[PDB]
Design a protein around this motif. Sequence first.
Motif: not given
Length: 81
Positions: A56-58, A27-36
């Motif tokens: 939207r998910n891993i 996973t090279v960018k895990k999702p966040t509230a700032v970026d889903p």
Amino acid sequence: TDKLDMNAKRQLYSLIGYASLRLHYVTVKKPTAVDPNSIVECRVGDGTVLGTGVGRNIKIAGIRAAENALRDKKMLDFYAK
């Protein structure tokens, strides 16, 4: 619409998933509230990237990444030796 082949991982692994190759999803960018968005790469052991997925998910990301690796036929030709 989030269309997706749920067999992609399984299908890629069956073609080029030699143990010696260390085929792995990272996973090279895990999702966040700032970026889903989740961005996942399908990699071999020496780091080279075969497929990159986003969604939207891993899990969905990691599946597109194989979906995308499967579409690259020069790459598949090479890594099935």
